[PDB]
A and B are shown apart, each in its own frame.
Chain A
Amino acid sequence: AFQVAKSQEEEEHKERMKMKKGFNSQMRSEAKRLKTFETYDTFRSWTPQEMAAAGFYHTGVKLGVQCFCCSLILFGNSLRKLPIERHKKLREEARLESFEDWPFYAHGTSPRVLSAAGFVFTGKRDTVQCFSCGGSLGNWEEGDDPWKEHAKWFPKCEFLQSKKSDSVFANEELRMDMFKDWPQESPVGVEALVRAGFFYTGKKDIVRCFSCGGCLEKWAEGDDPMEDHIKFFPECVFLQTLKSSAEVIPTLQSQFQEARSLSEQLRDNYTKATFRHMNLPEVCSSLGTDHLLSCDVSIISKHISQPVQEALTIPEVFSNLNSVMCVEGETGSGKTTFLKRIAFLWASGCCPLLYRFQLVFYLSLSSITPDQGLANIICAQLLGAGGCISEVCLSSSIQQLQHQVLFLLDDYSGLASLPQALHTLITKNYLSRTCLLIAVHTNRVRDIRLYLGTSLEIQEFPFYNTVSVLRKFFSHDIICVEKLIIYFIDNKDLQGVYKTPLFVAAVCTDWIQNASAQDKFQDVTLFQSYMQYLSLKYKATAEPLQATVSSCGQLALTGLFSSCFEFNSDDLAEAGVDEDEKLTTLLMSKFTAQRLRPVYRFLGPLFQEFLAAVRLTELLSSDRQEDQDLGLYYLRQIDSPLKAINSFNIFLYYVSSHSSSKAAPTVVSHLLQLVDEKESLENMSENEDYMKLHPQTFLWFQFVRGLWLVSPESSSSFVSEHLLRLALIFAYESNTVAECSPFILQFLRGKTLALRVLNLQYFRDHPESLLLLRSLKVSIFAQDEEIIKNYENDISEGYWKLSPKPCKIPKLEVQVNNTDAADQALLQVLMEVFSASQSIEFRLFNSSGFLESICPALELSKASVTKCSMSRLELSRAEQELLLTLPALQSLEVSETNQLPEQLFHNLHKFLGLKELCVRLDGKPDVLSVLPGEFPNLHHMEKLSIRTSTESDLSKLVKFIQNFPNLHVFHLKCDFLSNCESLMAVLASCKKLREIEFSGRCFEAMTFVNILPNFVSLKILNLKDQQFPDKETSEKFAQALGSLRNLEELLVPTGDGIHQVAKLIVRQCLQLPCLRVLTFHDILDDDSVIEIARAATSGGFQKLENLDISMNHKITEEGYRNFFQALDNLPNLQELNICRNIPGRIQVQATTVKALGQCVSRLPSLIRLHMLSWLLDEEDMKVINDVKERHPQSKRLII
């Protein structure tokens, strides 16, 4: 918004203090312009041609132009500000050929007053345009005041106001006396120009020699005084007495009435006005040409011995002309547009070498092979070739005036040796010292290559050409042009599909003849319309035109099959025969120079994927013998869900066209076939091509790997968002809404969904069935901001516009962060969705300014609230009275503040339903007083997590905590308890003690060897640092833990209980199944990891995944043996910490540690190894890197 104005001060003022220098007598030369307005960076959306003719000038740095009238630097050329117009707001033959085609109709207004008022006639029915307006119109009525009509038709033309509002001196002192009138714009040495033998005349830069009469052009600021007069006047007699024929050799290495009147007749005929016509406005038929009304391309000039020589321009063709030359491109398109460009603009004469070219000859040889020369085709497709002058005498008029004859030969690819004078002219090209051109495609450049000096390639510059054509021809609609240019940086490979600039007429009909793209502008509509043009152009039946479509479609199946793009030309079992149909169709071509077996090339590599999409609907809604087993075959070769987002986004979004739906349930069944997988990560990351958002696709892998890095359910939640999103677009656009609906209900269930409804018209078909999701989620970390970027590549808008009366809306989820305000509009959105949903899940994360938000939130809401998380609040009284007065609360977690809630506590002991607490860092000996108010209420409790700073009253705790029937996970920790008898009573008088967290309370564990035998079905046990000797706790906890084979997660602390406890305990935990987590912190000296070594050799361990050997005494080659077998033979483990021995543990024998990295790489199913508290080097970085890349199933090595 403002950052373009402040940044406009930044780079515009930084450039304003930089490059003010302007030599406003120098910058008028054309050749230095189109030379240096060609080969610069060119990343904008603006044509360099008429910006070199805008009145400004620029070098080639980032777009900073200057001028002579308004001298200011201007850069950052962006949309819709035409720089010829922005020049204003920031401050003979054409008229002759015009009225030549003058019809009979328009004579209520005279044509000569149209001649005296600046009008140009375009050779159609009575339509005009000015030389610098661009609008050809008819609509002729009576009283049309012509220049005032030009100010009254349309206000587009600012050329309206921009235009409306010697014989006695034959000595070098008298010649030099004429040279003392020297023009300022020439910094060339004047004295050498005096000694060059000229004298001045009186105009700009022409100059008149006295010996022969040399005057001529190419006079600029950095030229040579002698060179042009030598190499372009080699017969000046004073120069002959100055530099003779042996001295013009370095400049040589630097650079009849029937014949004449024949040249006058053919010169009068080759300036044809109706020759302009092209079917580039084919059915659109817009009143306009293709040079003054269309932009251009450039030349990839390539040398014959493989350097890519230059990228010349169209006047740079004229500078060093080629006596015989070939160009590659597209027939119908640019190449014949280049030839008819040469002839039609050769009927204009603006370039300073024009009007002196003699005889061009346009020819298209695709029609003929007529075994007869000039009179056949000049008398056939043109007017005539003369009868008094013979056809060989016409060829004698060629071979008598050869040096300025220019040829425009087309399509030797459809030509053999059958025309006589033609093919013998081409094979004997010396015998006419002429300029020959030819426009053969890249299938048959080899037959021309014997007669070539350099090759020329036509190439589109889709930076600016597509927005010039769609600018000028579609100024009627410019907001979709804004959609195009904003789409150019949302999709930065938009140049990767615009590959031919004169087959954008399908886009032209897809704006003026198909208005659907104006509200549906993404890619597949556009090149779907291009494919529809490929059905319209060469309209035919089910020939191998159509089997060229399908057969090159399975060439595209080989294209994305093994990711092969530039082919081998071996397997032509897909397409094969009649190459003229495939190159005439132009879906492919082949290699130019030598290969061993030559190489096929495409017009567009990503366009090939759209060909494979045509192949996929061909293999989706057609004969079901084995064809859809081929589409099913490759469609099952792509079966990994993390690859599905990007690869199925681009390619399956190409499949999102072609709505036929005869096996769309099979491909959305492949979308349901994607289940919870891990190897999909490097299934995508191993692949090579990524299509449009290519380094961004690398970033998609990085961020989704970051999603699985933290949260497995948020990663799969984003997977659910993209799978349900693209499956929703494909489902609604495929119209399989009642055909696949309960299968989509299988595609919904169990997945937790964050609320995204702005593609609501795809979703609102039947939301009641589409309503049984597992969860609903809103938050306010950076994930939802990236999702804002993802649609950017609302809630109640799509949600109530979705359903006017929602029904039975499921439960909800809230996260809030510390940067949240209290805007009431989103609180009204919360009023709507809380009025809709069942109940709320609610998470407070440091949210200040939420007291002023929780007052209107609970004010608007009613008493239906389940979960509240109280992460680091302010703990004020009024908002917890307002939270307090709502019944049916079920969940409240309180673990943060040293400040203790009192009214919320003792008044939280009133209601019913509550099952979640927490009491971390509070401190209470006496706060338990109205807790016996809760004691009649709730036998419904599912989370208990207590901390006190000292001893509380325990009789109430043993009483009603004894009165619990529905035990659960417990978190208990950290006070001066000193009472194992009350806790022995309550833990001895209960039933369901199967998830116990007793991490580090001051306590004597004599109870646990009594109450652990009372309950056998325990699954999770956590303990932090206690007293733990090696015969009392080792024998008694060897029995008590020995009879406890139901456990899954084990956290044992901090004892001098020594390796006998590893014998019996590592024995029994070795010999129990259903076990996942295991932790031996502050214990396991090296003989105890001998016990995990010899124990871990035999097995019985294959269920385990998580394991911690933090805090050994010393790991060394001992640990290489023990972690060799123990980190070898156990193919399910994934967790390891070796750390916090912090000062100096490089006593590990580092190369044997590299062998231990070989040993960890033996383990397939590992994820996180933590190799902390020793030095690495460069070497083991390369070692754990390279052996990490052996199987990439792991990702978490932590230094």
Chain B
Amino acid sequence: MAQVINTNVASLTAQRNLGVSGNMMQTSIQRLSEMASLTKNQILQQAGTAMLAQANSLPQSVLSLLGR
């Protein structure tokens, strides 16, 4: 009943889609056998999954930190 929650877990649904960007890292390790695209996606989107990884367990820290 804090109501900083609903679009923040549609946002966490998008953060699980950054988990699907973790599956895009699995696609990049799947796709081994010019590459500046893979450079910016792996490094930049890895930094974005880090930001939304601490900021994805951080709303898990909200739910494991708010009294319910």
Contacts and interface: CB of A to CB of B under 8 A. Distances in A.
A1170 B12 CA distance: 37
A785 B40 CA distance: 17
Contacts of A629: none
B2 interface: yes
A3 B6 CA distance: 11
Nearest to B38: A1198
Interface in A670-708: 695-696, 699, 702-703, 705-707
Contact of A699 (B5, B50, B63, B64): B50
Contact of B65 (A78, A695, A786, A1172): A78
B11 interface: yes
B12 to A, nearest CB: 7
Nearest to B21: A782
Interface in A693-728: 695-696, 699, 702-703, 705-707, 709-710
A709 B51 contact: no
B62 A699 contact: no
Interface string B1-20: 01011101101101000100
B11 A788 contact: yes
A1 B5 contact: yes
A19 B4 CA distance: 34
Contacts of B14: 785
A786 B63 contact: no
A782 B39 contact: no
Given A706-B43, A1139-B34, A699 B48 contact: no
B8, B11, B65, B66: most-surrounded residue (chain A CB, <10 A): B65
B23 interface: no
A789 interface: yes
Query: In terms of DSSP, what is the predominant structure of the interface of chain A?
Result: helix
A485 B5 contact: no
Given A3-B12, A482-B2, A702 B50 contact: yes
A1134 B65 CA distance: 48
A485 B65 contact: yes
A696 to B, nearest CB: 6
Nearest to A82: B67
Contact of B51 (A486, A786, A1139, A1140): A786
A13 to B, nearest CB: 16
A707 B45 CA distance: 11
Given A7-B63, A489-B65, A1198 B39 contact: yes
Nearest to A782: B48
B68 interface: yes
A1111 to B, nearest CB: 12
A710 B44 contact: yes
Contacts of A292: none
A79 interface: yes
B51 A78 contact: no
Contacts, number: 95
B40 A80 contact: no
A4, A7, A81, A707: most-surrounded residue (chain B CB, <10 A): A4
A87 to B, nearest CB: 15
Contacts of B44: 706-707, 709-710
B61 interface: yes
B44, B50, B62: most-surrounded residue (chain A CB, <10 A): B44
A489 B58 contact: yes
Contacts of A792: 8
A80 B68 CA distance: 9
A76 interface: yes
A561 interface: no
Nearest to B34: A1139
Interface string B27-39: 0000000111001
A76 B40 CA distance: 39
Contact of A80 (B47, B51, B67): B67
Contacts of B18: 782
Contacts of A1172: 34-35
A488 interface: yes
A486 B62 CA distance: 7
Contacts of A782: 18, 45, 48, 51-52
B44 to A, nearest CB: 4
B65 A699 contact: no
Given A1-B5, A489-B58, A1139-B34, A79 B48 contact: no
A706 to B, nearest CB: 4
A430 interface: no
A746 B65 CA distance: 44
B5 to A, nearest CB: 4
A489 B61 contact: yes
Nearest to B50: A699
A706 B8 CA distance: 25
Nearest to A11: B64
A482 B4 CA distance: 12
Interface in A72-131: 76, 78-81
A482 B43 CA distance: 36
A703 B48 CA distance: 7
A23 interface: no
A7 B57 CA distance: 13
Contact of B67 (A81, A706, A1170): A81
A538 interface: no
Nearest to A7: B63
Contacts of B63: 3-4, 7
Interface in A59-80: 76, 78-80
A1196 B65 CA distance: 40
A4 B5 CA distance: 11
A2 interface: yes
Contacts of B11: 785, 788
A4 B2 CA distance: 13
Contacts of B55: 786, 789
Interface in A1-17: 1-4, 7
A716 B64 CA distance: 36
Contact of A709 (B8, B40, B58): B40
Contact of B68 (A4, A702, A709, A781): A4
Contacts of B68: 4, 78
A789 B2 contact: no
Interface in A1132-1178: 1137, 1139-1140, 1170, 1172
Contacts of B39: 709, 1196, 1198
A703 B12 CA distance: 20
Contacts of A1170: 34
Contacts of A4: 63-64, 66, 68
B66 A79 contact: yes
A696 B58 CA distance: 12
Contact of B9 (A1, A79, A482, A786): A1
B6 A1 contact: yes
B3 to A, nearest CB: 9
Nearest to B67: A79
Contact of A76 (B4, B43, B48, B64): B64
Contacts of B36: 1198
A486 to B, nearest CB: 7
A78 B52 contact: no
Contacts of B43: 706, 709
28 contacts: A1-B8, A1-B9, A4-B68, A7-B63, A45-B65, A78-B66, A78-B67, A482-B2, A485-B65, A489-B61, A489-B65, A695-B54, A699-B54, A702-B47, A703-B50, A706-B47, A709-B40, A709-B43, A710-B40, A781-B48, A782-B48, A785-B48, A786-B52, A792-B8, A1137-B34, A1170-B34, A1198-B35, A1198-B36
Given A4-B64, A699-B47, 13 more contacts: A45-B65, A79-B66, A485-B66, A696-B54, A699-B50, A702-B50, A705-B47, A709-B40, A709-B44, A786-B52, A786-B55, A792-B8, A1140-B34
Sorted nearest first, the 10 A-B pairs with minimum C-beta distance are A79-B67, A4-B63, A1-B5, A706-B44, A782-B48, A706-B47, A78-B67, A703-B47, A80-B67, A702-B47
Interface of B: 2, 4-6, 8-9, 11-12, 14, 18, 34-36, 39-40, 43-45, 47-48, 50-52, 54-55, 58, 60-68
